[PDB]
Structure 1
Amino acid sequence: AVKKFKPYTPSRRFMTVADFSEITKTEPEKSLVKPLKKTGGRNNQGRITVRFRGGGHKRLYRIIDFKRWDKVGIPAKVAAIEYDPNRSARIALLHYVDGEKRYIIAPDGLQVGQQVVAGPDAPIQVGNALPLRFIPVGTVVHAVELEPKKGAKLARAAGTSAQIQGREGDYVILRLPSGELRKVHGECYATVGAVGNADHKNIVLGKAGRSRWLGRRPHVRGAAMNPVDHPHGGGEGRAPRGRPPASPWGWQTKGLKTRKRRKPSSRFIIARRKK
């Protein structure tokens, strides 16, 4: 439940911060971090290839277990729930009875001291990981592989979930967080439950400095630039677009579809996204 501040500065008036209620442990597992190499948005040529990036807080990467079929049948206790600056979800620490320790992303409802397990035999219970074909239809799942053994690709951001709708041969029908209906191979893994920290969408950054902390440098409007710079650049005074609204590189940016035509995964999308 997001926390408000009293308006004792102009920015505190609107700032909201996460309650951090579910966090039980406040420093990371030293065996499961590595340095996160900040890019600033620059590629191996040194060129900015994603604008308006840099200057955010320092972070360590928490190694996340996106397979779990690594360790079928080996149960695990929920040691803690920790903060991860690298994603929107929270992460949960697992002390396997194996003695091995791993992080997974924390679904909604998971409690410290509960057990989790992964496998075709697993109980349909929040925190468990099964191949899609064994989860009952109608179940809300997250951290879904897209192809067998390639790692959880879908429904990982805070609050998201995919819902199983039906089965067709070797394939199950998922409704993704976007609302698209897709066929995912029944051997792909998924974790029962939805991702936690749903209140994440209700955070009000509150002032410009907050975006800077996150690595988000100021975004400048095409309309504000010059014709050398952008289709919307120039004009005496302010100016409407005066042409179909366009990106810095000239392509149209209000409706123009961009998914590749003959993409082979088209055979497996059933219905494009909603709303």
Structure 2
Amino acid sequence: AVKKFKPYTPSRRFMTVADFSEITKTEPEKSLVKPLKKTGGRNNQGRITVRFRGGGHKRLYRIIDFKRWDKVGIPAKVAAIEYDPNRSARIALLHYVDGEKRYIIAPDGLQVGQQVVAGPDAPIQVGNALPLRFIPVGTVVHAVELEPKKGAKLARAAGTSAQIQGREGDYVILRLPSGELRKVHGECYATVGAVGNADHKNIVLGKAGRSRWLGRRPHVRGAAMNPVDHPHGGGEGRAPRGRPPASPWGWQTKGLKTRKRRKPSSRFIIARRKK
């Protein structure tokens, strides 16, 4: 439930914030945090390669366990649900009966005190991780590997999920968060349930300053520039596009497909996204 503010400043009028009601622990696990080297959008040449980045709040990176087949059969308790500034989802602190402590991204409905486990034999319950081939068709799933042992890759953002549609040989058929129908190898692990914090999408940033907090520097329209800078630059007064709308680098930006044609994974995409 997003939280509103009374309009006691111009910006508080529309600003909304998360309720943070699922959170039970408010400083991270010291053995699981490392510094997050801010880039500012600069590569190893020093060059800006992603425009408009920098100056957001300082953050520590929380190491997340995206394998889970690392510890087959070893159950764990859910000790805490915590805030993670590096992702939209919340994260869940796991205490294994091993004594090992790990973070996973917190699925919708997970409760502190419940137990999660991973493996081919796991109960089909929220928080458990199995290879895709052992999960019953129709199960809503998240944190899905794309190739075996390579790490969870799909459906990690707040509120997302993938749905198991069918089986074909060594492969299961998933509906990705985007609506694409894809074949993913059955040995790939995935976690039962959807990702939590589904109210994420309804947060209203409220003011320009709030975008600055997130490391998002102001974005300049092409039409505000000069011809040295952009296809849309220049003109006396305002100006329509006057050409097919383009990016700073000349390529078209209203419809032009850009997935590489001869890509080997095309053999595994059943149907492109819609809507």
TM-score w.r.t. length of structure 2: 1.00
Residues 70-93 of structure 1 show CA distances to partners (whole Å, capped at 9, x for unaligned) of: 000000000000000000000000
**Aligned to 1:17, what secondary structure does the other structure show?**
coil
**Aligned to 1:212, what secondary structure does the other structure show?**
helix
Residues 177-232 of structure 1 show CA distances to partners (whole Å, capped at 9, x for unaligned) of: 00000000000000000000000000000000000000000000000000000000
1:173 paired residue number:
173
Distance 1:274 1:6 in 2: 39
Distance 1:170 1:35 in 2: 40
Report the alpha carbon displacement of residue 274 of structure 1 after superposing the two structures with TM. 1.0
Residues 77-136 of structure 1 show CA distances to partners (whole Å, capped at 9, x for unaligned) of: 000000000000000000000000000000000000000000000000000000000000
Residues 37-93 of structure 1 show CA distances to partners (whole Å, capped at 9, x for unaligned) of: 000000000000000000000000000000000000000000000000000000000
Percent identity of the aligned residues? 100
**Aligned to 2:120, what secondary structure does the other structure show?**
coil
Report the alpha carbon displacement of residue 238 of structure 1 after superposing the two structures with TM. 0.0
**Aligned to 1:251, what secondary structure does the other structure show?**
coil
**Aligned to 2:251, what secondary structure does the other structure show?**
coil
Which aligned segments of 4 or more residues in structure 1 are displaced greater than 4 angstroms?
none
Structure 2 gap ranges (5+): none
Residues 132-159 of structure 1 show CA distances to partners (whole Å, capped at 9, x for unaligned) of: 0000000000000000000000000000
Structure 1 gap ranges (5+): none
Distance 1:109 1:233 in 2: 50
**Aligned to 1:205, what secondary structure does the other structure show?**
coil
Residues 231-261 of structure 1 show CA distances to partners (whole Å, capped at 9, x for unaligned) of: 0000000000000000000000000000000
Q: What are the equivalent positions in structure 2 for 1:205-216 lying under 5 Å apart?
A: 205-216=205-216
Distance 1:153 1:108 in 2: 18
**Aligned to 1:258, what secondary structure does the other structure show?**
coil
2:135 paired residue number:
135
Distance 2:157 2:274 in 1: 19
**Aligned to 2:77, what secondary structure does the other structure show?**
strand
Report the alpha carbon displacement of residue 18 of structure 1 after superposing the two structures with TM. 0.1
Distance 2:98 2:211 in 1: 42
Counting matched residue pairs gives 275
Distance 1:39 1:206 in 2: 26
Residues 13-47 of structure 1 show CA distances to partners (whole Å, capped at 9, x for unaligned) of: 00000000000000000000000000000000000
Distance 1:108 1:231 in 2: 45
Distance 2:9 2:181 in 1: 46
